[PDB]
Amino acid sequence: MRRIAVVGAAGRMGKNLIEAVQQTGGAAGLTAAVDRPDSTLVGADAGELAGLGRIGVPLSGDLGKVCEEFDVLIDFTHPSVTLKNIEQCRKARRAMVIGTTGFSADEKLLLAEAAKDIPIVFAANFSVGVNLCLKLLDTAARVLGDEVDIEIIEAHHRHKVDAPSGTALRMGEVVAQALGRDLQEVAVYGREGQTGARARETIGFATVRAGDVVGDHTVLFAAEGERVEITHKASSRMTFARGAVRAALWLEGKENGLYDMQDVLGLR
Amino acid sequence: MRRIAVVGAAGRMGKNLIEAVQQTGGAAGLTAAVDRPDSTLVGADAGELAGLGRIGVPLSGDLGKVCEEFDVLIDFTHPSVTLKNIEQCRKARRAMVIGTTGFSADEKLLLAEAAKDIPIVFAANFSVGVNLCLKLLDTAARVLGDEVDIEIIEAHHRHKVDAPSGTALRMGEVVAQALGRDLQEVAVYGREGQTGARARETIGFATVRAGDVVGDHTVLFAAEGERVEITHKASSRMTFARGAVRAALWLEGKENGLYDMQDVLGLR
Amino acid sequence: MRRIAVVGAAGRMGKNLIEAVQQTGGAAGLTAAVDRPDSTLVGADAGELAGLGRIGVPLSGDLGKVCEEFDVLIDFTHPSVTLKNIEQCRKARRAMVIGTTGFSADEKLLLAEAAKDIPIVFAANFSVGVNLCLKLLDTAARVLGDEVDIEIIEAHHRHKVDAPSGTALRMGEVVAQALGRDLQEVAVYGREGQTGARARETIGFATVRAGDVVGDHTVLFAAEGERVEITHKASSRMTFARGAVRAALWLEGKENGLYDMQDVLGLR
Amino acid sequence: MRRIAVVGAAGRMGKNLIEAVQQTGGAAGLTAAVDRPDSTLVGADAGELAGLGRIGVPLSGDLGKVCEEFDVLIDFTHPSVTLKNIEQCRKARRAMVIGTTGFSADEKLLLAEAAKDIPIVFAANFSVGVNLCLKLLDTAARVLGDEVDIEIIEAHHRHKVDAPSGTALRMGEVVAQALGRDLQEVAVYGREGQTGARARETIGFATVRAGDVVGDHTVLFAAEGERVEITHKASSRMTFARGAVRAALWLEGKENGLYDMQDVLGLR
Ligand SMILES: NC(=O)c1ccc[n+]([C@@H]2O[C@H](COP(=O)([O-])OP(=O)(O)OC[C@H]3O[C@@H](n4cnc5c(N)ncnc54)[C@H](O)[C@@H]3O)[C@@H](O)[C@H]2O)c1
């Protein structure tokens, strides 16, 4: 089977990753789990810590002591940690799946550099469903062309501070690019009063903020006689964990390089 | 059976009214149809003109010519026309259903003045479903109270000039009044950038403009653990015609006065 | 403030109840938390156990030792436990909110008996949104009458063994009763092949089983020209916890008796 | 401009085709309109008959009379009629768009035989959105694989006789073929009682019959953490007419052969 290590294992995503690894059924197995060296959770069973049954893998504090018991490392931590993990995995010639965000430009260049020596999957969004939708949106925009009005409707919980969501904006950009438009020029984010007849080129954003919604995204393509909607509904962050594990498996037998979920899903 | 006349019978709502009347299964029947005396369609069968089979009712040009041949007049024309229609019905002591919009405050007083002598149903919206939703919203808002975020999502076709719709704003007003809020003070019509966390008092409007959508309206009430949605979808203007016909039957036996659809539907 | 005890505090619902109590903001406060006497969690902070900050209330093993530090007891345990709690609360003249399910008929009679001496809220479903929807459905069915086709669409996760859900069936019964129909006679649960034109009286159930869906419920009322949909979407069991806490507060100053959520919500 | 003739011009699709042709912004124009020689509508303007302004094209009764006045014939009539239409177009060497349904396997061979001499677009469904969705479904199914539960939810009006729709079954077949399943073996059309936990291979159909719904189709792909939905909503039969007109323009310059909408839309 595929031997998978998880670093940041005691974290929110790390716990989800442990779970998604066990849910592959002998395709993969957890062989290592690493968190902070100064963590009082060090020594505890990684399975128990994630709310699962006892797996038989203790939480350890140093990737170096276990750096040879795995085939691939999945990393959802913090840039300063991932850089150190990159170093150890590169030296040990082990593949990586990196979900950590917030890398600086210089920190990013290190990723491509390490990708000379090891195969890496690096993605800002590991959701299989979201990445699939991004491809479907490109196909739909190209087929439907300038016949349709395109509107992006999203809902998120009452605590979200940014609107529209990063995902909605990305969907907007996919559509804009497919139709040769500049999103920033044609985007509308609200409507109040006498707005007038809709321009065909407009990409409209209707944004709902309410309750505890994890994240709903719909792109509507509407013309006379018909509507097409492509919709993603998230219920938890397990979607990112499952996509990371898929990436970890996909990496088996792959040439050195820097890949993303479009590669993993065969959508590029 | 109930003898129904339709004025503005060649118009958009007029044609729908003819169809809605004929569809009553024999409870009612069309006995007169009037449009402009100006009309080139004068003489043509009312059924044929509405795309139905021949009904046996020619399109008349003068309400006065057929004044003594109907129990109730349904009027979807124009304020100037209705004000004249009213005086004729008032003198002939005939009941009216008035769907015409755009009356001044003074003219409404004139309608009421006439309603002293005849029963009249006068409503800004004759859709049974929309008026029902207005009542359901008041109930929902009172029960859920300040615990929920309330968002009003609507979609209309690409040629609609005003946003949010009059129906969406009315839904807004119903919820605001139930919760003791000033809609103008708490309404939000768009979201862009760092809007920050949502204030509970906010009534948000997310408005979609696209394709040929006749009119979709949803009110979302959201809190931790659950969403409640009250939704109306219009497929054609037949919804208003059917509601007007329901009013015309309801008027039978009613004492003089000025009524609305909340009276007709018993929602008051 | 309102002093609230929670029994079954270490359980799934008990943990949610602790959380919903703290989320009232001085309207209520947790003063006691009881679970199994033989629990090794006894002594631990009820707040910490539920994943919250330290509340200052230890988990105890016996309601009797604390039976006077609270105004109302919320109980989500098991019938054999609740019966004992009923006894202690009755003697101490303390109100109760009972969410425990699975009572036998004889066990139920004890509830009504205790309700001679104390005020009790007892409900099979403590969700405010679901109970609200049940009332809205009655209003809608009565207003729309035999003009509409009524269809109940629900979705639940891939592990649910019963179809349609208990909630969908209850919604079906509300509608059936409102229109004077027998649900069992008019219900349809699937459609395959040449089913023919739809009978107006039919109440249709379209049931989706997929993924991890917690529970979506929609009642569609459809006629020519329009659709009305009343929809409840659950995201977690916190909805039941929040409704129980509302009941606990509602009980303040109430006469002895047996109440349900229709009373709490003022919908009866 | 492209010279388009419509046969069955007085029919339901015929009228829609006339409108769709006139709406092309001058890319195309109607030059002939044929219905039964039997027709009482013979002589009437094609625009007027379709509820449009006078177009200047009288309804003809014989395809042979106008055989040399169009580049492409759009045919939505009846198999017996189309088989004759084909031989005339074949001899006049005129391209065809055939929307007529209900051909035998032998007659399809005859269509192909004719397609040896003229270019023909022949499709069971001319909606651009529906055909697009068929392609998106194949992509979605291949990417998501055996990880998801796949459910097909559709709604149609109260007079539709067959369930699920032909479009829903086709969507079922697309997904089944992508995943190497036998649709007949894995399809489920209803759920009642203790159905038990869902098998992953199952393709579920939840079918709604209600009101005047022209046709809503949704395919849900669900797994832990996320739902993906691909949705088509038809508002009128204009969707098929617009697609047929797109095909008629696409045919310009095409070599002889038998084409479908996957060719027209480049989805192959
Ligand atoms: N790409 C995606 O799809 C996606 C999705 C969700 C989150 N993220 C990113 O994943 C990262 C983690 O998110 P989280 O919410 O899981 O944060 P979190 O803080 O819950 O978990 C982070 C873990 O890193 C551990 N950690 C810190 N220093 C360490 C070290 N030196 N060695 C090992 N472990 C160490 C912390 O102890 C903690 O357990 C963030 O960058 C977040 O943006 C990416």
Ligand SMILES: NC(=O)c1ccc[n+]([C@@H]2O[C@H](COP(=O)([O-])OP(=O)(O)OC[C@H]3O[C@@H](n4cnc5c(N)ncnc54)[C@H](O)[C@@H]3O)[C@@H](O)[C@H]2O)c1
């Ligand atoms: N209350 C509602 O629910 C509702 C819904 C839709 C429309 N409306 C209102 O209905 C009215 C008409 O709507 P429409 O879209 O049918 O417009 P329309 O212009 O198609 O119909 C107007 C008809 O009135 C006829 N008319 C004009 N002067 C006349 C006269 N002196 N005597 C007789 N007929 C005369 C015109 O010839 C035309 O046929 C507008 O005020 C619109 O706002 C109300």
Ligand SMILES: NC(=O)c1ccc[n+]([C@@H]2O[C@H](COP(=O)([O-])OP(=O)(O)OC[C@H]3O[C@@H](n4cnc5c(N)ncnc54)[C@H](O)[C@@H]3O)[C@@H](O)[C@H]2O)c1
């Ligand atoms: N009415 C509703 O809306 C609603 C909603 C959800 C669950 N429920 C009902 O709530 C009950 C609990 O559900 P759960 O899923 O929370 O089960 P759970 O088993 O997670 O929690 C039950 C708790 O009861 C505790 N318990 C057992 N014996 C006890 C005793 N003698 N004294 C004190 N505590 C004791 C157990 O230790 C456990 O912590 C069940 O009857 C379930 O059907 C009702």
Ligand SMILES: NC(=O)c1ccc[n+]([C@@H]2O[C@H](COP(=O)([O-])OP(=O)(O)OC[C@H]3O[C@@H](n4cnc5c(N)ncnc54)[C@H](O)[C@@H]3O)[C@@H](O)[C@H]2O)c1
């Ligand atoms: N492929 C698609 O996407 C699609 C969509 C809708 C309908 N259809 C098919 O289109 C066909 C017609 O659909 P409709 O609903 O428009 O039916 P319809 O009967 O309204 O139209 C039929 C028309 O054909 C005319 N006709 C009959 N014999 C004729 C002849 N010998 N010469 C000329 N005209 C003649 C009739 O007079 C009538 O006007 C059916 O086969 C239907 O299945 C296909």
Ligand SMILES: [Cl-]
């Ligand atoms: Cl109500």
Ligand SMILES: [Cl-]
């Ligand atoms: Cl694709």
